[PDB]
Amino acid sequence: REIEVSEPREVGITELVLRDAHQSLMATRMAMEDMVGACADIDAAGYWSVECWGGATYDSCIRFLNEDPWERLRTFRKLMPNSRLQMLLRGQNLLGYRHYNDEVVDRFVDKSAENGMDVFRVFDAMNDPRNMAHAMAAVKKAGKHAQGTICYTISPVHTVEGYVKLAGQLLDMGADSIALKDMAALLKPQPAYDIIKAIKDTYGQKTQINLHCHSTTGVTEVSLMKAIEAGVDVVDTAISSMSLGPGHNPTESVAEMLEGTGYTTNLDYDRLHKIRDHFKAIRPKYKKFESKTLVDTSIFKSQIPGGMLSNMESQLRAQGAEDKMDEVMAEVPRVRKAAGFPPLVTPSSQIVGTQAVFNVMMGEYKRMTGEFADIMLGYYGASPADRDPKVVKLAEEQSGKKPITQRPADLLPPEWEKQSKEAATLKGFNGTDEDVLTYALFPQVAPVFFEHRAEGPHSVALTDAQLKAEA
């Protein structure tokens, strides 16, 4: 019995400590002040890229830290001059709350690249390539690296062949590399090997694939080893003092585990040690935002991500039917199916979760939320599988909207000029496209932020004094 493994080679590593690590472990509340001190070492560690922007950090900066996201980007570009900066961008949704007209996507990408972003990991919650298409083109126009993304999930319609097809569609829209995202740590070892190998066998060894796995279920570092045996080019990790739990596998652990296998990373262990210790000293200040579960494999049976489960709980707590949780968890699968089995990541997870609670309370689709209606009617794009025509009809007969099947942005009219005018009437607006984008992405937060931005970035973390006083 034998297993074919890739030839001895160097495996690239993407550090997530500056973005996804704290987004996953301390609600994206990491203050810029607590990160800049590790930039010099991070820049000289030897990482393939440094994820430090995008995701929920834009929202967090303006909503909780009174920090300008564009200033964070500029500072990181300046303190890590020799590194490839990387961000996560939700396609046509950008970092916003809805799909935007193509010109807004163009502006955003152009300004991101202009301010220093090198690698753009573009993804769509439902894996609809059409929603990633324009952002990808904008990234290529800016001469930057376009990383098309495949959100991994487990469902009756997701298969290896299905993932290989998506990889092809991403390569067809000019992807420079393919990212396999596993936000819920659902990727097991064998599937990791099979999917990576199938993509490499189908499109060629030159096809660059970056694997992003969280450690929530505790099985993905083994998946990382299997992905490396299958030939994956780069794997995402988080410095050891900011890893595990709903976060990611440890950078140092992944580097150390390869000794003697023929595979290696070229990270500087001394630099890694300094970055570790830097965050180990700072992490305690964020205890009020930490999660309390290091390993949870329940999703392999329920299909429900811990985050999604908590939300439904709170929704079943604030109403009075905490007794129907076992019923809700049984309803979710049915709602997911009806919606076409979309991956259960934001926002699909909230939409499916909330609708599941309604069906239990008010009754079988008796009342559909505005979001669920939009998903069923195709306003978020195509689903991995065909949506239940019966539930679709009900959505149409309850929202008054006609079902659509083409890229949603095709219906969106130009809005930049409209956004610029409205933004320019806000006290604090600095007249840059960056600020207009801030208003376009977060209309209800931009006002307050522009007004207080002059006060400078803050921190919602405990102070050393508060740490001591508490101890």
Residue 4 interacts, among Co ion, a second copy, none and using kind-specific CB cut-offs from 5 to 8 Å, with a second copy
CB of 218 to a second copy, least distance (A): 3
Specify whether the CB–CB gap between 224 and 211 falls below 8 A. Answer: yes
Cα angle: 396, vertex 402, 405; to 5 degrees:
110
Residue 236 touches Co ion, criterion: CB under 5 A:
no
Select from 206, 301, 427, 468 the one that contacts a second copy (CB under 8 A).
Answer: 301
Residue 273 interacts, among a second copy, Co ion, none and using kind-specific CB cut-offs from 5 to 8 Å, with a second copy
Residue 221 touches a second copy, criterion: CB under 8 A:
yes
Residue 6 touches a second copy, criterion: CB under 8 A:
yes
Q: Which is nearer to a second copy, 2 or 455 (CB)?
A: 2
What CA–CA distance (Å, rounded) separates 461 from 428?
26
Select from 205, 266, 297, 314 the one that contacts a second copy (CB under 8 A).
Answer: 297
Question: Residue 403 carries which DSSP code?
Answer: P
- The tokens describing 73, both together, are 């980007």
CB of 61 to Co ion, least distance (A): 18
What CA–CA distance (Å, rounded) separates 81 from 97?
32
Q: How many alpha carbons lie under 13 Å from residue 463 in its C-beta half-sphere?
A: 4
Residue 128 touches Co ion, criterion: CB under 5 A:
no
Nearest to 335 by CA among 315, 354, 308, 312: 354
Amino acid at 227: A
Residue 261 touches a second copy, criterion: CB under 8 A:
yes
Residue 2 interacts, among a second copy, Co ion, none and using kind-specific CB cut-offs from 5 to 8 Å, with a second copy
Stretch that binds a second copy, among 124-132, 189-197, 308-316, 410-418 (CB under 8 A): 189-197
Select from 92, 223, 419, 459 the one that contacts a second copy (CB under 8 A).
Answer: 223
Helix (H) / strand (E) containing 264: strand 263-264
Select from 136, 170, 244, 312 the one that contacts a second copy (CB under 8 A).
Answer: 244
Q: Which is nearer to Co ion, 20 or 374 (CB)?
A: 20
Nearest to 13 by CA among 334, 266, 230: 266
Burial of 140 (0-12, 13-18, 19+ CB in 10 A): middle
Residue 225 touches a second copy, criterion: CB under 8 A:
yes
Q: How many alpha carbons lie under 13 Å from residue 130 in its C-beta half-sphere?
A: 14
Q: Which is nearer to a second copy, 302 or 311 (CB)?
A: 302
Contacts of 300 (CB under 8 A, 6+ apart): 154, 186, 217
- The tokens describing 153, both together, are 């999930």
What CA–CA distance (Å, rounded) separates 151 from 121?
11
Residue 107 interacts, among Co ion, a second copy, none and using kind-specific CB cut-offs from 5 to 8 Å, with none
Helix (H) / strand (E) containing 450: helix 446-452
Helix (H) / strand (E) containing 9: strand 9-10
The site string for Co ion over 170-209 (x = CB under 5 A, - otherwise) reads -------------x--------------------------
Residue 467 touches a second copy, criterion: CB under 8 A:
no
Residue 219 touches a second copy, criterion: CB under 8 A:
yes
Question: Residue 183 carries which DSSP code?
Answer: T
What CA–CA distance (Å, rounded) separates 100 from 109?
13
Select from 14, 19, 20, 383 the one that contacts Co ion (CB under 5 A).
Answer: 20
Residue 398 interacts, among a second copy, Co ion, none and using kind-specific CB cut-offs from 5 to 8 Å, with none
CB of 15 to a second copy, least distance (A): 15
Specify whether the CB–CB gap between 419 and 440 falls below 8 A. Answer: yes
Select from 77, 98, 140, 273 the one that contacts a second copy (CB under 8 A).
Answer: 273
Residue 3 touches a second copy, criterion: CB under 8 A:
yes
Amino acid at 244: L
Q: How many CB atoms are located within 10 Å of the residue 325 CB?
A: 16
Q: Which is nearer to Co ion, 12 or 378 (CB)?
A: 12
What CA–CA distance (Å, rounded) separates 42 from 50?
8
- In the bound state, the residue with its beta carbon closest to Co ion is 20
Residue 20 interacts, among a second copy, Co ion, none and using kind-specific CB cut-offs from 5 to 8 Å, with Co ion
Q: Which is nearer to Co ion, 54 or 340 (CB)?
A: 54
If binding means CB under 8 A, how many residues of this protein chain bind a second copy? 47
How far lies 328's CA from each of 66, 102, 324, in Å? Answer: 38, 38, 6
Residue 294 touches a second copy, criterion: CB under 8 A:
yes
Residue 243 interacts, among a second copy, Co ion, none and using kind-specific CB cut-offs from 5 to 8 Å, with a second copy
Amino acid at 368: M
Stretch that binds Co ion, among 17-25, 393-401, 430-438, 440-448 (CB under 5 A): 17-25
Residue 233 touches Co ion, criterion: CB under 5 A:
no
Residue 2 touches a second copy, criterion: CB under 8 A:
yes
Specify whether the CB–CB gap between 216 and 182 falls below 8 A. Answer: no
Nearest to 345 by CA among 463, 146, 183: 183
- Residues engaged in binding Co ion (CB under 5 A): 20, 183
Q: Which residues bind a second copy (CB under 8 A)?
A: 1-8, 188-191, 217-219, 221-225, 229, 240-241, 243-244, 249-250, 252-253, 256-262, 269, 273, 280, 293-298, 300-301
